């Protein structure tokens, strides 16, 4: 997260870290046994870390649970990045209380201008590298499909949306993928891709979760 702020210990209870010997992607807990992430975050041997703040130190609120299933959307296209969503089933149910909680799926899509919360342990620099110990937060608005397509000609599908500031300086970045974009308590997006990070006229692109609600519910229920 570039241009953001320190969320504060466990203030984003649905945020999880995907670990494969180190943190490589984020994710969103939507059920005690399921996490939503990006399809490009698929890896074997994934361990989901919940209740995390400082990802480099054990603080006492963490739950480390292995992924028992990592289901990439059947139509994910690794070239166009269309349908960039993945469902991860936890080997054992996560313990929910206050520092670890699920986030609701959307009942309807969000409109341009809606302010959302984006979070993650990704790079905090637009030029250079600096990975944070604690979770970072960013408030950013969903942008119009028209502005998104103008920013990324011939690259934006109906399953993607842009969010951020065209002036640059605030954006998600490497290490944030698979993470949440929550608007009004609903998970509307998944950190997906973009041209660099926090660059002018290059807002982040996110998977449009509202288009996958029925698929998510049915897939989770059939696995």
Partner 1 sequence: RPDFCLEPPYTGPCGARIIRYFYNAKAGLCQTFVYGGCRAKRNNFKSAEDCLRTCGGA
Task: Compute the distance between CA of residue 103 and CA of residue 13 in angstroms, rounded to an integer.
Answer: 8
CB atoms within 10 A of CB 153: 7
The stretch near partner 1 (CB under 8 A) out of 18-26, 47-55, 108-116, 180-188 is 18-26
The answer to the question of whether 15 is labelled as a binding residue is no
Q: How many residues of this chain bind partner 1 (CB under 8 A)?
A: 28
Of the candidates 27, 132, 175, 189, which one interacts with partner 1 according to CB under 8 A?
175
Integer-rounded Cα Rg, in Å, for the chain is 16
**In residues, how long is the chain?**
223
Give the residues lining the site for Ca ion (CB under 5 A).
52, 54, 59
The pattern of x and - marking residues 79 through 118 that bind partner 1 according to CB under 8 A reads x-x-------------------------------------
Query: Which listed residue (73, 84, 102, 176) is catalytic?
Result: 84
Q: How many beta carbons lie within 10 A of that of residue 13, not counting itself?
A: 18
- Token pair in block for residue 1: 């997260």
What residue 4 binds from partner 1, Ca ion, none (CB within 5 to 8 A, per partner kind)? Answer: none
Half-sphere exposure of 137 (CA within 13 A, CB side): 16
Active-site residues: which are they?
A: 40, 84, 177
| Binding-site annotation, residues | 52, 54, 57, 62, 171-172, 174-175, 177
């Amino acid at each position: 997260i570039v241009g953001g702020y320190t969320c504060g210990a466990n203030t984003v209870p649905y945020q999880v870290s995907l670990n494969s010997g180190y943190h490589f992607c984020g994710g969103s807990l939507i059920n005690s046994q399921w996490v939503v992430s990006a399809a490009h975050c698929y890896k074997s041997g994934i361990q989901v870390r919940l209740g995390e703040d400082n990802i480099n130190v054990v603080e006492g609120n963490e739950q480390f649970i292995s992924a028992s299933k990592s289901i990439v959307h059947p139509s994910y296209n690794s070239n166009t990045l269309n349908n960039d969503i993945m469902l991860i089933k936890l080997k054992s149910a996560a313990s929910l209380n206050s520092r670890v909680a699920s986030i609701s799926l959307p009942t309807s899509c969000a409109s341009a201008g809606t302010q959302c919360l984006i979070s993650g342990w990704g790079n905090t620099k637009s030029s250079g590298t600096s990975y944070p110990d604690v979770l970072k937060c960013l408030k950013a608005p969903i942008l119009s499909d028209s502005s998104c397509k103008s920013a990324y000609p011939g690259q934006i599908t109906s399953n993607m949306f842009c969010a951020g500031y065209l002036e640059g300086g605030k954006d998600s970045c490497q290490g944030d993928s698979g993470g949440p974009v929550v608007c009004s308590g609903k998970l509307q997006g998944i950190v997906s891709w973009g041209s660099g990070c926090a660059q002018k006229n290059k807002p982040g692109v996110y998977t449009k979760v509202c288009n996958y609600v029925s698929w998510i519910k049915q897939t989770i229920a059939s696995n």
